[PDB]
Amino acid sequence: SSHHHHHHSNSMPDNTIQWDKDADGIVTLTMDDPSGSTNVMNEAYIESMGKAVDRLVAEKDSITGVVVASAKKTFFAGGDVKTMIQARPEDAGDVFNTVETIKRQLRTLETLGKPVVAAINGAALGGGLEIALACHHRIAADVKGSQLGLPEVTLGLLPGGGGVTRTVRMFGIQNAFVSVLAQGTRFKPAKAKEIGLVDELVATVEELVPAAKAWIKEELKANPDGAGVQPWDKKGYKMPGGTPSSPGLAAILPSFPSNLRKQLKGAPMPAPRAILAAAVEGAQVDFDTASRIESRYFASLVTGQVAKNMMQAFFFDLQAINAGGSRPEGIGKTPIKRIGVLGAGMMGAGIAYVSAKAGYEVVLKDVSLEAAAKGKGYSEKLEAKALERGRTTQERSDALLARITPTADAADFKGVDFVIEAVFENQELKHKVFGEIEDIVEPNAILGSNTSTLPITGLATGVKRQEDFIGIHFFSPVDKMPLVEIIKGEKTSDEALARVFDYTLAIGKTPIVVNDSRGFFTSRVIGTFVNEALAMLGEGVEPASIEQAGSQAGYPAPPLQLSDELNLELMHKIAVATRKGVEDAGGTYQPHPAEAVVEKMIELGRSGRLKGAGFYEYADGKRSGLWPGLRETFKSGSSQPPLQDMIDRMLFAEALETQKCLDEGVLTSTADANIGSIMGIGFPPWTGGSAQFIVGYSGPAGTGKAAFVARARELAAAYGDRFLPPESLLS
Amino acid sequence: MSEEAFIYEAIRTPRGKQKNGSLHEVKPLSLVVGLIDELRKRHPDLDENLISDVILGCVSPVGDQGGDIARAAVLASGMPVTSGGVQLNRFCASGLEAVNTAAQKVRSGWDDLVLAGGVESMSRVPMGSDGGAMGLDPATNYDVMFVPQSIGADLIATIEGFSREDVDAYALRSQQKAAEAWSGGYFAKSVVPVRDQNGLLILDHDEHMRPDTTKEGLAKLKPAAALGGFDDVALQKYHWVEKINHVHTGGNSSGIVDGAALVMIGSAAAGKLQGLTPRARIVATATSGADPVIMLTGPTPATRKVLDRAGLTVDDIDLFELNEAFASVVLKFQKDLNIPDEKLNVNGGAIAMGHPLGATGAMILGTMVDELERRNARRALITLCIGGGMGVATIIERV
Amino acid sequence: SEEAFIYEAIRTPRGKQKNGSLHEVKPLSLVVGLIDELRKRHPDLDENLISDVILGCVSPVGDQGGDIARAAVLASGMPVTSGGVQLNRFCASGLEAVNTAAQKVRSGWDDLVLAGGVESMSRVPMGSDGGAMGLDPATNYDVMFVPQSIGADLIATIEGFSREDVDAYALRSQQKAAEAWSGGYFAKSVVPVRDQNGLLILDHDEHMRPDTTKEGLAKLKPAGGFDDVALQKYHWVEKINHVHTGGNSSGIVDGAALVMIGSAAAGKLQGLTPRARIVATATSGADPVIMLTGPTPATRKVLDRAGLTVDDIDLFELNEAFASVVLKFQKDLNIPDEKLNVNGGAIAMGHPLGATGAMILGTMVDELERRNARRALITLCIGGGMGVATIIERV
């Protein structure tokens, strides 16, 4: 019943809200947390808003309207992740009471009998937007960088401060879930006003509070009976799209969970289904009962394991990387003038597009002008699709394509201070291609290589300045894949790391730093994923089950489909190089059981999508379906393991392989392993990464590293020694 | 388990079609009262005080079908106020469940004479009108992988290998045998024509029938769950299946119709005291189930259980009556138990005449009572699949 | 042939209508919570031997539509072969489910059956399902449809029950319900409701007003021309004395109840200990306008059917729909006052339509065992003029 966290009995949190009442009786609450640069929904805020809301009630006779504003660059962003990530199952009561107290304050503000206007000066994300949604009118400043939304589903949470309950009562169940809640979409101020999230816009922040007080003065004069009354608090309120008992919405309502299950492909992500349950259940009862249900589902997510995985990766791990965690400490800046891409394939053309989209002049060289020209057409094809979708102007798109200069002459790399080679996976080819350009480019130019497997130290011997040679690994398609794997050669200087680090941030991608070792991190770990699936196929498991297993595990692409695009001939020479290194050192090579399946498909002339046929069939450039001869070739169906066994084998192979990379020194931090596996090779976000998967594993037999080892030993006894955990995981 | 339960009367209304149907103007309460008044016409001297309960199956008990429609029939038809009245809902088997529950009440000895049957006016109260604890609860719907019956039937045809021509061949077979049964006079005394408050005829035949159905006409129909996502959900459980072959259309699936059926069940002493002649005996009943996503494989374990409970095998049964909800379900049932074709739905089924959810079980039960007498045969086994993957089966024996 | 035994009888607490604790709880969850409690009582129970689940529900629409019994089977992870059927016989649905389960067990064609009922009246108010007896003018004009409260006021007028008489019965129901709670009688059978996090939602019967006084009951006010309709049939009555209020009538609440029933062999096979035996069941009826007079011939019928009399019965449990109904029943059969609704009734604890019959049934199973008594007779009046009665014997 109270607006405060405690009601009994040293140390109290600071005040974060400034109070000001004008002569008209308009109170301006200015949130300004002194402990940071951004207002956050922490214990200091809850106490500060509690006093303010108590004061609004005590002085209601002398108060005519309220304005909620901020003194930071942003409006209000997020909650206390450090506290919510520590919530144990036994802490469910505390979590429940906290969000109930938070919403009790916003509900009093909402039913004050007076108009409350939010002056949104900057970003209002998560808890910030929830405060604004509790106001009766929302004005945002159309400023650069301003974002509005409820992105807590991306951390495994849900909008627990009224975000679910209010958006559903503003837009209906379907629109609120699809457009705002299910994916936590961020919106620019113009988009926010368009969908109903924001009511009015202003050009500058200085107009906000005056325009807010203006709207108060006009709302009081024009609509005195409905001032400070939300639409759902009026007698004739009718939910958009109907309530679950309305015949129209009831006809399509049972299909909402199945459509969500279609989207998620059966992956174990509990937050979206918790949002759907809270939304629908809330729409069946009054606002207050709906709000309390919202608290129970929220507490269910916060104390769960998936939210801790997601909070660990997408908040803590990402922030450490973005703060230069893998970047060398004392290195300055070196701006880039002209980028030179070698090769106009899918990789080289995608690299030139994301470089031009960032504002860089790119020279796109290939062996023929016809080839380089068709490479720039990749950028024109993406810009033409962004023009139709209306995401960029014709004036801005023309300047983007004008920074791409397709050529076939090596002399056109004159004045280039950043080289990104993306030619065929062959050492002496890259040696030759770099030799033809190392003297034409600037003497301080970075010599980057987009290599998947060949070690950078060996590639560096083909140039003169090996200190400026480095591995800059992108992922197809470059215009969408957000990771850049930076590979440190033995001769690579620390300054070269920082320049590629800064370049990665300039083009809007996330970097990880990896020490030189064949397979690096991404390619080596993703190999164990497709190898486990090809093993199952050779063991007689149904292909349809293998693909279903990969999708229900949470992967963006099933493993047989991914194998057809990695090309099986490339997988072959990867094992040949591995077999050569062992047998040249005098050892005995233990081949992976998948190698027999690769060489089998090579012999049958089905080496992948690039050569027209693989595990799938391809017609007119599109994938048709599983090759019917696949079942007869491998006796599909003779082995029928549990689906979870198939799922765990793929996840554990990568998790175990990540632990080796950490042990061998390939990776330097768990943050790089988690983000690198999520953004690079598509490790399921619900795991929080392939390293987090170990410390946060949850199965029927328990949770944590101990339960991971027990399950790994369970898999090893039934499928092979490769599932045995390393000594680093044992006690 | 002492008293033997006997069927004394089993009648039904004709089934009116969904679109521009003759029964659309007829309240479902009237369809039942009409059958009650027919029973009075056939036995004017029966002491209705000896009727202890009226049990009606109804899958959508809302609106015209809410408020315990069985009790409404007792009061509206002027039956004794001590005759009770209870509605039950066990999805498609509600009609047969009502009969089975009536028979089990007689066997316990604590009931003497019971009316049982069902009513479903699907043109007035569409399937789903009652909402549903599974549909209105995404937390439930997400966990238990809800899949509509039409997709389970397509999945059955895919696994078992029933082609589009196979299911359409059965659909043609159902239309033919239904027309032969009507033309042969088989339904003359059990299908009670519906009349208005003035005695004017409203419907006297199963107007959903398409007796001039051809193989080519069936092949021209389009497959039928139009929102999507359920196929992906289904294949998430049946992960070894790659593609669902949608083969079911409106011509090889049960018809949406209006109708009702009444069955009179009592002990030997009850019928003897009221001067009634027993037509058949309830030998055994059973209830089982199967996979909830495939949903429609429930009739098989319920049939094996009722056979084992009665100490019989498939050979001992003369007639098999299975609800024609979907052609593939019947072909799966026939394939599993090696049912001879000449013994399976010998007078047609729901594909031809319709499937009034809550009443279907009592309709096909009475259809077998009449066909056993017409053929002078001994045993018949009646079964229906159920939503949520349940099964109900009943064995009757001619007396 | 077979004898039917009760092995478990549990119920949720009853949450009130206004600002009730159970209003945020879907009725499906109420049932699933009780299923999970039975599993806790017998974790080694082979659920495959459960052949049906029978639930009473008077308003099977919305959250209660679509065969909520089958939903409980699927949502709780019970075997798909465990069945699931919803039935509606108005107020007796909960007891009708128990009787039907017993009769199925007696027929030998069911081995182990779960029975009970569920009614979330704060989410699905009564009348939400519609109905021909109310919404069809042709048949409404013939059956003389009258709300049950007026039938109760009519009973008090004929039998001569004053306003003080019905309030005096309402007082002892509050006193006896409070004494049963404080005495620990309900400590085992009332299963507290919790949310998905384990947090408590409700652990007691909110509708109870244990500080009720006779002076407070007098301050209450009594509740379409239905008076003229009733007096048209009962023509010898000049005026109906409206003595029933919200304090001497049943409370509108949310709740659910479950009862596990099976044969002696079925229980012995599963290591269960029988608690009581179902001796006999009966169904009868009475006037559909006065409505609530069905229990008297139904109780007489179940006594003759079991070869018993009132003197053979230790406890009488009649649902407290209205005070005059219970006083009419007590007067007709001359029930001793210390044998009637000994642990309080719906006036204090509430009447969750579809679940009530199973709740008061389990209430007598516990009280027979606690008193070490032999027989109890349970009965409920029903809308439309019906009556259901059951006799149980402690084992």
Ligand SMILES: O=C1N=c2cc([N+](=O)[O-])c([N+](=O)[O-])cc2=NC1=O
């Ligand atoms: O056709 C027959 N039908 C029978 C039916 C019954 N019946 O139970 O109704 C019995 N019998 O009573 O044993 C014997 C029968 N013997 C027959 O040969």
